[PDB]
Curated annotation (Swiss-Prot):
Gene3D superfamilies in UniProt: Alpha carbonic anhydrase
Protein name: Carbonic anhydrase 3
Catalytic activity as recorded in UniProt: hydrogencarbonate + H(+) = CO2 + H2O
Tissues expressing the protein: Muscle specific.
Length: 259
């Protein structure tokens, strides 16, 4: 089906075989280089108005842990930034690596973080999420890096639910959670246009990658990387990494919202 993964056999180098978008010219993630980035004084701040009550479920689909929100109407919204209008929060998920010294998808001046949080939104202008996938700005993602430090209390609440989704196919209720609670102090961001870092890798994403990383504990990162990609009874298989290697920037330009 959508069969894919991050192993050498089913991994990123092979995704284009079944998912031809993977080989596109506007793929993500990318390496950011500050020598190649300027402050764009025209970039506006962004804001969110999330309803914690819009949270619905948490699930393990075999290649990440995802929280899903009610996006049947304009409930939890993201606005401003380089966006043409308000976008609906649909879900958030994470990428991680096998140890703390890597795991992020994007990198900044060569630096890699322990993980990357992606909050996925879409533009109601396009009617549905599925149709939004066919527009270069259909989806808007808030990318947040995760760095090692002190335990994050807000992140802990999320981690406390992982026990319910240890294996692939597991899905459990997850309500009353405002993921804005995870955001760092600064709303400073970089932006550029790219794709999903997972198949089918549609080129429909406006990236709002935050300058400041959220901090979590090494211990929390261990919990995050304790999930399995196998189902309740099978041969336990660890899901220890799910980050995609950097793709060609081509002629795209990343912009900074901050001086
Ligand atoms: Zn992602």
């Amino acid at each position: 089906a959508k069969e894919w993964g991050y192993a050498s056999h089913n991994g990123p180098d092979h995704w284009h075989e079944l998912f031809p978008n993977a080989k596109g010219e506007n793929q993500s993630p990318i390496e950011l280089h500050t020598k190649d980035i300027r402050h764009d004084p025209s970039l506006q701040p962004w804001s969110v108005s999330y309803d914690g009550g819009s949270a619905k479920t948490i699930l393990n689909n075999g290649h990440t842990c995802r929280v899903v929100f009610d996006d049947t109407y304009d409930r939890s919204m993201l606005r401003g930034g380089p966006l043409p209008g308000p976008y609906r929060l649909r879900q958030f998920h994470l990428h991680w690596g096998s140890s703390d010294d890597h795991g992020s998808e994007h990198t900044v001046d060569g630096v890699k973080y322990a993980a990357e949080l992606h909050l996925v939104h879409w533009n109601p202008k396009y009617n549905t999420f599925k149709e939004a996938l066919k527009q270069r700005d259909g989806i808007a993602v808030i990318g947040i890096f995760l760095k090692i430090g002190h335990e994050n209390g807000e992140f802990q609440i999320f981690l406390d639910a992982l026990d319910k989704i240890k294996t692939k196919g597991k899905e459990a209720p997850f309500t009353k959670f405002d993921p804005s609670s995870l955001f760092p102090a600064s709303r400073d961001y970089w932006t550029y246009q790219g794709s999903f870092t997972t198949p089918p890798c549609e080129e429909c994403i406006v990236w709002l990658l935050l300058k400041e990383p959220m901090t979590v504990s090494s211990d929390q990162m261990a919990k995050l990387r304790s999930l399995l990609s196998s189902a309740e009874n099978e041969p336990p298989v660890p899901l220890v990494s799910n980050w995609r290697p950097p793709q060609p920037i081509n002629n795209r330009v990343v912009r900074a919202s901050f001086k």
